[model samples]
Target: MLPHLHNGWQVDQAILSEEDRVVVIRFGHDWDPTCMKMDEVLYSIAEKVKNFAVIYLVDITEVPDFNKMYELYDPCTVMFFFRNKHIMIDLGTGNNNKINWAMEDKQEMVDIIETVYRGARKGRGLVVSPKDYPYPSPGAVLRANAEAS
Candidate 1:
């Protein structure tokens, strides 16, 4: 799931020029093993998402033009832009600017992209990434109870 190679200008151009689709870019640190784990998931779903999202990746230090502005120092970020406006996703991760963590749930990731695209097309600047069950899975709960018993 390494994204297409894009420089600062091309990155800017994409965010500026693409009026229809949601632009999804993943900014990762080269040293982190977790980076590819996330990208790997994205790579797996690349084919299924062609029509909805334009995804890309960049080194944490490569983009001199937008490094501090994007606050990549904050965490590895995944951001969406469409028609020149930032799209906020409320994934309950407590960050609206980008996806700061690698998501293992493919369906959840796919859904968020869909949500952003639909909302963007309709002119909504922010959308909710469907928060799946807030609690642990049933199997986990059962295991805990059995262990205690």
Candidate 2:
């Protein structure tokens, strides 16, 4: 699902709480080659990865507060999070002033996503606890139904 865009900052509360992974793109309307390339890469990845929730936050140049929330220092920076809890990666190639240099290539972005997901599945690093459930291991579903009724 797409996130709610507020003053160029997109917030996806549902994905934040429910999804296993998310990608936050901080972008603007500047016509730079790097930015254009990054956009293409993001669109391609979004098409392939259904489980990967994506959010595009634009107008960073106009929204100072939102930029502060994400600690965005450049136009094409991206932040990846797992289970809405832990930050897995922070990547941007651009300097503070130049917009073109800040964008990431398609292969780099895809690699980051694939690596993070694989790590999470391997029980190496997880944003949420794997054992914490609403009920006991086998009887959880039964207990959940009883409580609902």
Candidate 3:
């Protein structure tokens, strides 16, 4: 379960201060169809990847600073995996239609989750740009390269 960090600012610091890898999910009060569908997908993924800890950031509609930390992206399911000061992966957003389709077939979701977990373990962190090796984002290419190294 996700521990409450009091407010938005605390939540930001907690995530950034962590030394271990964690998956953070940011959600807002407004429920768009896409957001709702992604939420279900995340639930399924979490159950399968029980080894990984997940934190939920809720009620962030008015948290301007918090939103800026995520590069102003309002994705339904924004996942950030952090290890120490480095971010291993910044899974921007999953395909809503694909997620909805997979929900009908549980095996599909399982397969996807397993694939992601495998990549996370093999890469040892999130992929990043050449200039931002420790920060999340950039692209999967950087992560893949890190895995090979």
Candidate 4:
């Protein structure tokens, strides 16, 4: 599992905490299947994308403060922020507030994160997504396990 923001204050700091890197947060339930799927991609790409981004998880129920403010009605929502600025991505879905789908491919997720990082670094308020959008299913969740062979 990724580091989780337990409350609204923590979530606030997480977004404002990163000065030079994009703060990527997945808002959903820890036990949600969709969130679990997205979490896989997030966990795997953590180290690879560390140079430009940081990832976190926030259970919408655990911290309902942002629910109405962010319109977080979706089961899983991924948002990006840099230096306290909310970074938006044009996913062709008309909603740039956040990614509300289950990103199954790890590399694809990395690409999206990197794309936003580059855009945010260039001082962009909205960045275009690398791919087209499909009819989304809903929600996402994830966890991590370490081992050596």
Most accurate candidate by lDDT: 4
After superposition, which runs of candidate 4 have C-alpha atoms over 4 Å from their true positions? 133-149
lDDT leaderboard ranking: 4, 1, 2, 3
* Model 3 Cα lDDT, one tens digit per residue, 1-149: 43434455565556556543454544453356655565565565665655654555454565433344344355443445554222333223543211212134445444444544555556544432222112333233234444767
Error of 4 at 39 (Å): 0.9
User: What TM-score does structure 4 among the candidates reach?
Assistant: 0.84
Lowest lDDT block of 10, candidate 1: 133-142
Best by TM-score: 4
Model 4, total clashes = 9
lDDT of each: 0.69, 0.46, 0.45, 0.77
Worst 10 residues of 3 by lDDT: 94-103
Ranking by TM-score: 4, 1, 2, 3
Query: Which regions of candidate 1 deviate over 4 angstroms?
Result: 1-3, 132-149
**What tens digits encode model 4's per-residue C-alpha lDDT throughout 1-149?**
57998976787777756788998889899899889888888888999999899999999888876665577888888988887777778877757878888877887778888889888889898888778762111111111111211
